[PDB]
Amino acid sequence: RNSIRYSELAPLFDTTRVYLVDNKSTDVASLNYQNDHSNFLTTVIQNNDYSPGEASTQTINLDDRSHWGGDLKTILHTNMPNVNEFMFTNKFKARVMVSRSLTKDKQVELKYEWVEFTLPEGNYSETMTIDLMNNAIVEHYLKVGRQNGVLESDIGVKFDTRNFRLGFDPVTGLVMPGVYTNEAFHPDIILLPGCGVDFTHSRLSNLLGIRKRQPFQEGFRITYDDLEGGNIPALLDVDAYQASLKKPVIKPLTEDSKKRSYNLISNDSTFTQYRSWYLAYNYGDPQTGIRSWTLLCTPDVTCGSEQVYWSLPDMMQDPVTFRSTSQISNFPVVGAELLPVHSKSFYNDQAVYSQLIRQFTSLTHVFNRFPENQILARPPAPTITTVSENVPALTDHGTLPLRNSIGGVQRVTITDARRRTCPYVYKALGIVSPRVLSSR
Amino acid sequence: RNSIRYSELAPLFDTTRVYLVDNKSTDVASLNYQNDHSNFLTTVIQNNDYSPGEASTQTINLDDRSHWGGDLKTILHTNMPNVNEFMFTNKFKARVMVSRSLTKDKQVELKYEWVEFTLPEGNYSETMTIDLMNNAIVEHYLKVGRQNGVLESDIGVKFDTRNFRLGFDPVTGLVMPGVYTNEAFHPDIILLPGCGVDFTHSRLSNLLGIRKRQPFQEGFRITYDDLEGGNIPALLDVDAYQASLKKPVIKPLTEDSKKRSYNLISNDSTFTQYRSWYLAYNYGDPQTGIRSWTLLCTPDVTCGSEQVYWSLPDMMQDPVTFRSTSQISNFPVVGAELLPVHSKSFYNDQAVYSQLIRQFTSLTHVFNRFPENQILARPPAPTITTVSENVPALTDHGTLPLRNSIGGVQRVTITDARRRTCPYVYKALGIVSPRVLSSR
Amino acid sequence: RNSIRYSELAPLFDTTRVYLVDNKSTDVASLNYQNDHSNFLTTVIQNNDYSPGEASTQTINLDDRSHWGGDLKTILHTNMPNVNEFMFTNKFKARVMVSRSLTKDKQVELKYEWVEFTLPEGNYSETMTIDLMNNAIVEHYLKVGRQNGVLESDIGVKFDTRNFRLGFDPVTGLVMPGVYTNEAFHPDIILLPGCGVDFTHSRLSNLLGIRKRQPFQEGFRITYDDLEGGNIPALLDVDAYQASLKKPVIKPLTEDSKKRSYNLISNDSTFTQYRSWYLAYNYGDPQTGIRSWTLLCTPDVTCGSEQVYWSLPDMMQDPVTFRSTSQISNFPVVGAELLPVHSKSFYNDQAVYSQLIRQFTSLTHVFNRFPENQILARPPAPTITTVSENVPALTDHGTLPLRNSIGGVQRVTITDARRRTCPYVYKALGIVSPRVLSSR
Amino acid sequence: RNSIRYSELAPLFDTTRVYLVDNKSTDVASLNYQNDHSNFLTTVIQNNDYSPGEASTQTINLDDRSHWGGDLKTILHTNMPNVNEFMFTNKFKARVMVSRSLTKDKQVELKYEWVEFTLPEGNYSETMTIDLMNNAIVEHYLKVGRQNGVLESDIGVKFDTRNFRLGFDPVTGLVMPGVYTNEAFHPDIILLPGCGVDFTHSRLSNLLGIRKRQPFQEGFRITYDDLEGGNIPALLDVDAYQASLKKPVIKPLTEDSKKRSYNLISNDSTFTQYRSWYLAYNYGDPQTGIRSWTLLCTPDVTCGSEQVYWSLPDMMQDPVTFRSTSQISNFPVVGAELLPVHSKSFYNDQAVYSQLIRQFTSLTHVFNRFPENQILARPPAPTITTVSENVPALTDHGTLPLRNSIGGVQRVTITDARRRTCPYVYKALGIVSPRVLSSR
Amino acid sequence: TFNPVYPYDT
Amino acid sequence: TFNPVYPYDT
Amino acid sequence: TFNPVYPYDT
Amino acid sequence: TFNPVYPYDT
Amino acid sequence: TFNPVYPYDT
């Protein structure tokens, strides 16, 4: 009526457990080899005698007269890096200045080009991720920039995280303090005329916390031109003003120590040519600015909760509309589950008291190369850093229909959103508990 | 009896799984486009052949002879900012002084007006949120105040967080220490004669931790006049008293460095014209004061746990009393769930040892502009800051009735309390597992 | 057989969902007004047409031929303060000295009296709560003590948190170090002859971590007399002893800077008149001391996990023995749940290195007024502070019986242990899913 | 029909509870003795009379006419060390230099050999674990290295955690800063010519966060030869260059204080003979380098979530294909569960500001023995340390078939992946609740 | 003869 | 007569 | 004329 | 000629 | 000849 028979052993009734597990010493040796914990074979047999493979011949038979089903809970555990190549978090296109030249007697010829910089897999934490990006912009300048004109003064594109506009005085037209108040509010990207960044093929966008208000329109390009209204205002010549006590004030600090120009639009304007995203969003025209088509969001280092799909092709019936095949990247799905990664949050009031000390701690100002320029400076570390953290996930799918004849060797397969094994799985295993559902 | 048929594939029995998911490469391209993760279409088909849309023609049929239902668990993930425009946490009305004038020979003409200040989306943490508010009060004074008389001495409205009354001596009538003990206890709002604040259209109220004891009476206005009994007492002239060793004591420090007046009611009284909410609450008449109609509550940065409602118009039967429609903002609801945001709490004994150091860390005293005035000073950072943090929510709704003919394309929709898509959704997807419930 | 009918809409079968929610824009306007999130009305109707109230006329009918029941999960969220009046954590009676007088030629007349001090709602954290208490003892002395004789030297009652007995030498009879080792172990309360404290009407007791071994005997009074054996030993005259190198030693420091007496019992004894609870507990007679009827327990700031009861008078059948009534404070109960408050624990090795720095951070020694007296000093901050933290609670009650005719307007009510609405509820809402249970 | 009888007591019906527990005072005395909490006996009897053993005679009988099953939830609690011998985390083979000699007139004879170093069980935290490893490399050099030639200059194999390549200038061919930027990015292992490490028999590999892209091919050997492309570049002679202001630059610092050679390949090249894994991975040929067959992963101190299997040989029926035996290491399995260990993550910006202070805190530079050599230096402590933490696990297995005659003494057994008791179990106990499933 | 009850010195 | 509203001294 | 792009002074 | 392998200076 | 067992110096 509801048996469960196996080769030659006492028949069992009503229910039991078949175990899908990678570890088994025997099968690892033989079976999987060129496989990994995301696409492997395993014997469900569990009987000490019998050579695996020869096991493959045997079968667990759930009484034929009834349609069976089984509860499937699984234990999935990864250890995927915040920033890696497979997830698309190690690359990102941006347009920078390539050459600054003296041409055809009087012309200033500026040549800009798009280029894709890559990051060294792993390096978690958001802030640091920013830094690694800024550094990659530089590392490039080091291989092309300088040796083709282009000064530091005109480095296009830099990810910062502050509100260049806190000091700002509605009359002066300047950041009175003479310094862009060094506190971190949200990541944003700053651009110089003519350049900009593109994330079309990168989840890092999600790390900065900047998304399109219309996601499905593939094409994340944020040009200098887009950051309308909201160019970082200029600094008051704190020195002049004070010493001068008319009043100098109108004097908008044009350079800095080591004399770098703050590219001011004209000898008059209080504004600089440096455009900030964060500004355009909440300080620019809400109806036509950038706030119109992009959204200011919480960072999230994981870069985006993605899901993984399970499949047990040789043991569960194929769900409603999937068709059975043998193409690993199209197997039927039997369970979906978010990919095991969380955002742990911490507190480091030590940030920026630490950037200050961190710089001495790290024997180099590698990230802060321009410790004077109020722009190109090293963005403030925000209190509350986030870090992707891997965690085992004791998930639980529902009862799923089973085949009344379970093969000795079952194939287990965890796929990702785009349907492809996921290299970062360290442990995957599931427990199935069959039971009756109705009869034929 | 209980089949589950699809186009031309083997019939399935008893149960299975239909998946509602946004990601699918095909549909994103075609279908949604002008949509977002809170109002999108998706094919439930999952069959590799067939052009989406042409998929739309097909249908999953749950045996007609029985009434089906399906378990619906979902995975929702947002990343909404502590302070943003859509949630109503970036604005707040307050009444400040606009002009101080010398008029009609002997009259002192004070003109006050209401005005709505806005904040720059994002900027989490409660303390800092306070600061951003205080700053907005200022930023306004900078554009209207000064250039119309009104000194700093008479800046109306400032959010602080301390107990101006710890030093207080029941005889002296003064805060003996000569300083308002610089420790943070709870946010409160201080007012000058004639002004005050209004939160009628803002959840920030909930951030300060001040609520009406009768919520539903739309209208949160807290006037200076309301803060009866409980005007910040004055400071002992620590210098005079000591040097003088009758005893000066009665001397209540009238100004401070850079000479700002502490607006004392009269040449006699030990009290200042500055009224504090926090005082009125626990130091004023309990029967008629403010403690009568407002409640001192725990802060909470999220500004208020709000819920979101799901709806699968084309797949579930319409719950008891909802009527079926096509107006996105009235679809039937099938599941309610709190909007994925928590209050992580941290410890920063570094607060106020940090405000002290934070000021040097941040190259500007932007928030502390009046580092002498014991009132207008920068509120102490409280130990234990809170920060809204986004978290994926693996929720689980119950079994819901299904239509016996599930369309190829289902429409998914997450709405908010007021019934409107929620821009801050990054990932939404659900798994439905149909099963029999009874027969016709 | 198992329908579910509504006015004039297609009948639904087997199950569905009725939603109890406060937010609804319509009902808030009309219905509740003078109510709050703990006692409100709401329409279950959910049909866009129909004026609420007129909605009230309609009804959801669960087929009559069967007894129905519904699963009731709810979402409760508060934000109640650690210390507030409603929970009984803002008051506490203690007996202090009122007057010290020179009488009838040679008599020293000491007059003691009981008095109830109150705290300013909110002020979380345990340590700080202690401080606020000690401060209230003082604040009183400031209004009565001094101006009636009584010196600081003889201030009765002070909550501390250290083991006055670590230095102690079994021979010397003194705390050799000349200082009561400044580390925090557990809160305790110290008393002078004749005085003491009473918590009979306060949960703060639970905050100090001192409970009766026989709870139900209403009456928590802890007299000086009770703290038998275990009077804080005295300090070695570190100065004398050393400089003197017989050996002075026997010299038990009688005062301190600013000359305050350590009330030593006699010119001989090494013990002081100051009695400590913590001492009596583990250093006094275990059979007759205080350890006999009180228990040393873990602090816990929440002051005591209390529960709240739900009630849906107009929608669920009245549970076994409750009788139906209309007295809000006796409605039948359908679900119990702990009141949403947890004890988050942190680490601040910064404690006492911070009290040391905290005192400079806070521009006043408001809490440490007697920085010399080894007793009246400011208790050490313990590493590991606790803080009540509010958290949304996604609870789940079981299936409960329903009435076969659900009214258009249901009344929701969350009560507390003593049966009274709870002002601190910000959000309450529940989802009910009816389903058959048997037939008539 | 569905009774449950016992010796001579009233029959019980439908269900009840049998308890499997180790603690019992009686049985511990007699029964187990030479056993442990992972392989013990226990009486299910629970009847105060009757000598255990004599209890063993009795039996709980579940009505014979029906096939029973029981829900089995268990409470498992361990306390296994991050690094211990049983889990294979205290050993690890590496190949180091043994002897440096002057031979046969002009030959430099280098003799290398493999050797297995062990660690002192316990010592959690990842960083520190690294250190303990590096130290073991040294401790060996101390017993063989020096006393056979080989200088410190040529110590093969050292686990570090930084990106020797941040300073790097694409033109100079040197790390301009003159210092390998002291910040931690990911663990990696550095090798000198001729040597290397092997983890074939160790999970520490998983601690470093370096795994094979093809796990099942037993054999983790990472030779110097493998770390192709990606030898730590050399340092700029910061001193020369500066003082010299042609420009020296080309000068690649050959030694350091205490004169140790940085083994530069030739008098010309800017590269050193030191090869870094981390470099090869993301800086070397992606198609043939190491990134081809190894994967950069998140650390994880637990070394690898392993599972444990339960078995109640004398109480549950043997699951599908297991055969009943008496060989403790082959008992049938009835439940699988991950071994109770998690990765708690913390923040210590104090790292490397602490290594700096930690060295003075620890009265010895035991781990930093070569505080000058930019390589052999002590790796930077990474912000965010991980620590294996033991946690009780309230797991829940499903209903499992039972024998209709439960013996007085049941045998409980928790096994591990390889099938062997696990010494680290402190508490194991389960609750079984039988109930009917069908009849015979 | 008034005790401010506050150590002004330090 | 212009208030920068900023304590430049400190 | 070579920019090391690094503030060696500090 | 014995290397203690320990920087005693600092 | 009494050991206070306490390093008073430091």
Side-chain angles (χ1 to χ4, degrees), chain A residues 257-258 260 365 369 371-372, chain D residues 238 242, chain G residues 6-10:
Chain A
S257 322
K258 298 191 181 168
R260 309 154 176 303
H365 306 85
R369 303 195 160 196
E372 314 82 35
Chain D
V238 62
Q242 257 194 326
Chain G
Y6 187 169
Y8 291 83
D9 68 335
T10 302

mmCIF file of all heavy atoms in Angstrom, chain A residues 257-258 260 365 369 371-372, chain D residues 238 242, chain G residues 6-10:
data_model
loop_
_atom_site.group_PDB
_atom_site.id
_atom_site.type_symbol
_atom_site.label_atom_id
_atom_site.label_comp_id
_atom_site.label_asym_id
_atom_site.label_seq_id
_atom_site.Cartn_x
_atom_site.Cartn_y
_atom_site.Cartn_z
ATOM 1 N N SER A 257 48.864 73.925 -0.958
ATOM 2 C CA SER A 257 50.283 73.669 -0.813
ATOM 3 C C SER A 257 50.636 72.941 -2.111
ATOM 4 O O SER A 257 49.749 72.625 -2.910
ATOM 5 C CB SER A 257 50.530 72.751 0.393
ATOM 6 O OG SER A 257 49.660 73.059 1.477
ATOM 7 N N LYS A 258 51.917 72.679 -2.326
ATOM 8 C CA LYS A 258 52.319 71.985 -3.554
ATOM 9 C C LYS A 258 51.571 72.425 -4.827
ATOM 10 O O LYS A 258 51.496 71.695 -5.794
ATOM 11 C CB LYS A 258 52.197 70.469 -3.345
ATOM 12 C CG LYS A 258 53.101 69.924 -2.240
ATOM 13 C CD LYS A 258 53.128 68.402 -2.258
ATOM 14 C CE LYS A 258 54.004 67.860 -1.143
ATOM 15 N NZ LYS A 258 53.810 66.392 -0.964
ATOM 16 N N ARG A 260 48.357 73.002 -6.629
ATOM 17 C CA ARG A 260 47.507 72.244 -7.558
ATOM 18 C C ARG A 260 46.319 73.170 -7.785
ATOM 19 O O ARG A 260 45.827 73.781 -6.834
ATOM 20 C CB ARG A 260 46.989 70.961 -6.909
ATOM 21 C CG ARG A 260 48.042 70.104 -6.267
ATOM 22 C CD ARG A 260 47.433 69.266 -5.157
ATOM 23 N NE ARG A 260 48.403 68.351 -4.565
ATOM 24 C CZ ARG A 260 49.072 67.440 -5.261
ATOM 25 N NH1 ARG A 260 48.868 67.338 -6.571
ATOM 26 N NH2 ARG A 260 49.942 66.633 -4.655
ATOM 27 N N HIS A 365 51.251 56.529 2.457
ATOM 28 C CA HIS A 365 50.099 57.351 2.143
ATOM 29 C C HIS A 365 49.652 56.917 0.736
ATOM 30 O O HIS A 365 49.290 57.750 -0.101
ATOM 31 C CB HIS A 365 50.490 58.841 2.159
ATOM 32 C CG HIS A 365 51.156 59.291 3.431
ATOM 33 N ND1 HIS A 365 52.511 59.157 3.659
ATOM 34 C CD2 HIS A 365 50.649 59.893 4.533
ATOM 35 C CE1 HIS A 365 52.808 59.660 4.846
ATOM 36 N NE2 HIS A 365 51.694 60.114 5.398
ATOM 37 N N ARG A 369 47.823 59.843 -1.460
ATOM 38 C CA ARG A 369 48.787 60.578 -2.261
ATOM 39 C C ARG A 369 48.702 62.109 -2.361
ATOM 40 O O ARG A 369 49.724 62.768 -2.547
ATOM 41 C CB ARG A 369 48.780 60.008 -3.668
ATOM 42 C CG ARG A 369 49.081 58.542 -3.702
ATOM 43 C CD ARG A 369 49.432 58.096 -5.095
ATOM 44 N NE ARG A 369 50.157 56.831 -5.081
ATOM 45 C CZ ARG A 369 50.853 56.362 -6.112
ATOM 46 N NH1 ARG A 369 50.912 57.059 -7.235
ATOM 47 N NH2 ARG A 369 51.500 55.206 -6.020
ATOM 48 N N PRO A 371 47.457 64.518 0.027
ATOM 49 C CA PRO A 371 47.044 65.057 1.326
ATOM 50 C C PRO A 371 46.876 66.550 1.491
ATOM 51 O O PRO A 371 46.833 67.040 2.614
ATOM 52 C CB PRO A 371 48.096 64.502 2.271
ATOM 53 C CG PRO A 371 49.301 64.503 1.429
ATOM 54 C CD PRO A 371 48.804 63.937 0.127
ATOM 55 N N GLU A 372 46.786 67.291 0.400
ATOM 56 C CA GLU A 372 46.620 68.723 0.547
ATOM 57 C C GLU A 372 45.376 69.117 -0.191
ATOM 58 O O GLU A 372 44.504 69.791 0.362
ATOM 59 C CB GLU A 372 47.805 69.477 -0.041
ATOM 60 C CG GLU A 372 49.172 68.924 0.333
ATOM 61 C CD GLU A 372 49.584 67.737 -0.529
ATOM 62 O OE1 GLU A 372 49.238 67.723 -1.736
ATOM 63 O OE2 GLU A 372 50.269 66.831 -0.006
ATOM 64 N N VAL D 238 64.380 55.010 -0.944
ATOM 65 C CA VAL D 238 63.851 56.300 -0.530
ATOM 66 C C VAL D 238 64.947 57.279 -0.096
ATOM 67 O O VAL D 238 64.940 58.444 -0.499
ATOM 68 C CB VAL D 238 62.830 56.129 0.624
ATOM 69 C CG1 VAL D 238 63.520 55.513 1.855
ATOM 70 C CG2 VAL D 238 62.177 57.477 0.949
ATOM 71 N N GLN D 242 65.870 60.779 -2.468
ATOM 72 C CA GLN D 242 65.682 62.095 -1.844
ATOM 73 C C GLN D 242 66.972 62.891 -1.651
ATOM 74 O O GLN D 242 67.114 63.997 -2.180
ATOM 75 C CB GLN D 242 64.965 61.965 -0.489
ATOM 76 C CG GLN D 242 63.479 62.345 -0.511
ATOM 77 C CD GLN D 242 62.886 62.537 0.887
ATOM 78 O OE1 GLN D 242 63.274 61.854 1.840
ATOM 79 N NE2 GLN D 242 61.928 63.460 1.005
ATOM 80 N N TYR G 6 53.668 61.124 -4.812
ATOM 81 C CA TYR G 6 53.721 60.674 -3.440
ATOM 82 C C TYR G 6 54.367 61.775 -2.617
ATOM 83 O O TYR G 6 55.484 62.202 -2.902
ATOM 84 C CB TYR G 6 54.520 59.360 -3.308
ATOM 85 C CG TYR G 6 54.470 58.760 -1.907
ATOM 86 C CD1 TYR G 6 54.939 57.473 -1.637
ATOM 87 C CD2 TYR G 6 53.946 59.490 -0.844
ATOM 88 C CE1 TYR G 6 54.880 56.938 -0.328
ATOM 89 C CE2 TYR G 6 53.882 58.975 0.450
ATOM 90 C CZ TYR G 6 54.348 57.700 0.711
ATOM 91 O OH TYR G 6 54.283 57.228 2.014
ATOM 92 N N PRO G 7 53.644 62.279 -1.607
ATOM 93 C CA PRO G 7 54.147 63.334 -0.725
ATOM 94 C C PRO G 7 55.184 62.758 0.267
ATOM 95 O O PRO G 7 54.827 62.364 1.381
ATOM 96 C CB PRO G 7 52.874 63.826 -0.036
ATOM 97 C CG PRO G 7 52.054 62.557 0.072
ATOM 98 C CD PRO G 7 52.227 61.990 -1.319
ATOM 99 N N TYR G 8 56.453 62.698 -0.152
ATOM 100 C CA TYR G 8 57.525 62.166 0.697
ATOM 101 C C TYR G 8 57.703 63.030 1.946
ATOM 102 O O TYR G 8 58.067 62.535 3.014
ATOM 103 C CB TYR G 8 58.844 62.054 -0.081
ATOM 104 C CG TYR G 8 58.840 60.983 -1.162
ATOM 105 C CD1 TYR G 8 58.296 61.234 -2.420
ATOM 106 C CD2 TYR G 8 59.371 59.712 -0.920
ATOM 107 C CE1 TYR G 8 58.277 60.247 -3.417
ATOM 108 C CE2 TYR G 8 59.356 58.717 -1.909
ATOM 109 C CZ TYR G 8 58.808 58.991 -3.157
ATOM 110 O OH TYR G 8 58.784 58.023 -4.143
ATOM 111 N N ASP G 9 57.444 64.326 1.814
ATOM 112 C CA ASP G 9 57.520 65.249 2.964
ATOM 113 C C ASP G 9 56.151 65.070 3.695
ATOM 114 O O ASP G 9 55.132 65.663 3.326
ATOM 115 C CB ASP G 9 57.623 66.690 2.483
ATOM 116 C CG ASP G 9 56.343 67.162 1.823
ATOM 117 O OD1 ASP G 9 55.585 66.295 1.321
ATOM 118 O OD2 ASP G 9 56.093 68.389 1.789
ATOM 119 N N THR G 10 56.179 64.290 4.770
ATOM 120 C CA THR G 10 55.032 63.973 5.635
ATOM 121 C C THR G 10 54.358 62.680 5.175
ATOM 122 O O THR G 10 54.693 61.590 5.657
ATOM 123 C CB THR G 10 53.925 65.117 5.719
ATOM 124 O OG1 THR G 10 54.508 66.345 6.187
ATOM 125 C CG2 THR G 10 52.783 64.699 6.701
#
